């Protein structure tokens, strides 16, 4: 009922820490213990496929692309807040990284259950997340910088 998730830097292939997932009566808590990340807010979402391998897009390599799109069991095909229902159920609150490159601020996803996360990937993006597909799709998260699979 409680699984630690190893996270790997997609560019370097080097481990950057772990993320602990806990079920509580309000949702799933995500407690990071990561390092070597660029300071600031990062797009943070659960993804469809249970893989962190790369994919291919029109001739270019997509790091962590094998994970697929954002977890969306309701097939909303929209990106939004962690507290709104008509958008990817995998949309999590943005993840904060200190000036020292560390991420330790815990975060909650009220619409998720721990059980449904098994076999899915957790992704950390380079850009932020304004919880909209505007001006940039998927909240402007951009490239995927860190990933881990939830066994």
Binding residues for its own copies (CB under 8 A): 24-27, 29, 40-41, 81-85, 93-94, 96, 98-99, 104-108, 110-111, 130-131
Three-class DSSP labels, 18-87: EEEEEEECCEEEEEEEECCCCCEEECEEEECCCCCCCEEECCEEECCHHHCCECCCCCCCCCCCCCCCCC
| 125 binds Zn ion, rule: CB under 5 A | no
Rounded to a whole number of angstroms, the minimum distance from the CB of residue 126 to Cu ion is 11
Query: Binding to Zn ion by residue 79, rule CB under 5 A?
Result: yes
Give the bridge partners for 148, in sequence order.
122
Nearby residues of 95 by Cβ (< 8 Å), 6 or more positions away? 32, 41, 42, 43, 44, 103, 105, 107, 124
Q: Is residue 123 at the binding interface for Cu ion, with CB under 5 A as the rule?
A: yes
Work out the burial of residue 18: count CB atoms within 10 Å of its CB; fewer than 13 is exposed, 13-18 middle, 19 or more buried. middle
Smallest gap from residue 14 Cβ to its own copies (A): 26
Q: Is 91 within any annotated ligand binding site?
A: yes
Contact 117, 108 (CB under 8 A): no
Select from 42, 88, 89, 120 the one that contacts Zn ion (CB under 5 A): 88
Residue 88 in marked binding region: yes
Contact with Zn ion (CB under 5 A) among 47, 70, 120, 125: 70
C-beta of 28 vs 147, nearer to its own copies = 28
16 touches, from Zn ion, its own copies, Cu ion, none (C-beta below 5 to 8 Å by class)? none
Which segments are annotated as binding site for Zn(2+)? 70, 79, 88, 91
Binding residues for Cu ion (CB under 5 A): 45, 123
């Amino acid at each position: 009922q409680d699984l630690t998730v190893k996270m790997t830097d997609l560019q370097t292939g080097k481990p950057v820490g772990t993320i602990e997932l806990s079920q509580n009566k309000y949702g799933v808590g995500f407690i990071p213990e990561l390092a070597d990340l660029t300071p600031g807010m990062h797009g943070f979402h659960i993804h469809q496929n249970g893989s962190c391998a790369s994919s291919e897009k029109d001739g270019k390599v997509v790091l962590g692309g094998a994970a697929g799109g954002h977890y969306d069991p309701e097939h909303t095909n929209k990106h939004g807040f962690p507290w709104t229902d008509d958008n990817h159920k995998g949309d999590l609150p943005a993840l904060f990284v200190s000036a020292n490159g560390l991420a330790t601020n815990p975060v909650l996803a009220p619409r998720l259950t721990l059980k449904e996360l098994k076999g899915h990937a957790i992704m950390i993006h380079a850009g932020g997340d304004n919880h909209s597909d505007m001006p940039k799709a998927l909240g402007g998260g951009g490239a995927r910088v860190a990933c881990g699979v939830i066994q």
